[PDB]
Structures are given as C-alpha cells and as structure tokens.
Amino acid sequence: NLNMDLLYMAAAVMMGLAAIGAAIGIGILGGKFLEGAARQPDLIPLLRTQFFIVMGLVDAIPMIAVGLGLYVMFAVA
C-alpha cells in the first residue's frame, strides 16, 4: 500500500544526508592530517593515532542516521 513507498523515500533522504555529512567531514579532517604528515613524516604514527581518535567523534551521528535508515527500510519495511 501507500505506506511503503514513502518509507523507502524517507530512508533515501536520511541515508543520503548521512553520507554527505560523513564523507565531507572525514575528508576535511584527513586533509589536515595529510598536510601535517607532509611537513614532518616521522610524526606519522602519533598523528595517525590522533586522527583515528577524532574520526570517531566525527563519525558519531552519521552512523546513527544510517542505522535508523536500515531499521526503517527493512525492520519496519
């Protein structure tokens, strides 16, 4: 019936927005990580540690958004 087609559309909008957010945020972060690396490579492991730390903070919401996208798309169908 009429419900399902809008439930798919809503999952689409939600996951597309989550995708733009996660992608562009992590790109902005990785850019600074790389330009820090290029100036002094020996610090690469320490910088990579800091990067994998902060990347979770940026990743926080988008993964909730996509989780609920999947929930809407399949569990509620």
């Binding site: 290029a38 100036r39 002094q40 490579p41 020996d42």
Partner: protein
Amino acid sequence: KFINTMSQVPTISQLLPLPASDDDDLKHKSWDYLYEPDPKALLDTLLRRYVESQVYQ
C-alpha cells in the same frame, strides 16, 4: 686570513653567487619548516644577512 700567530695570508674569495658547501642536508629529509609568512621573503633576508656577516668576519 689569520692562520698562525707568525703567519698571515692574503685571500680573495667569492661571496656572490653563493659558493656550494659539501654539507649534505639529505639527512634533513625528515622535516620541513613552517614559513611565516612565506619562504621566498625569508630566503632573501637570510642571504643578505649572511653576506653582511661574512664581510664582518
């Protein structure tokens, strides 16, 4: 050139263009500077101050 108390020698030596030392900073591969504001304006003053310092020496 003051060499030894009993001996001194006249020398003509070049200071422009810059003569090329054998010091190798290939070991400095490990890093590069932060340039405030930019490297091109800094290299100029470094070269001028270096020439003045060699004349003073």
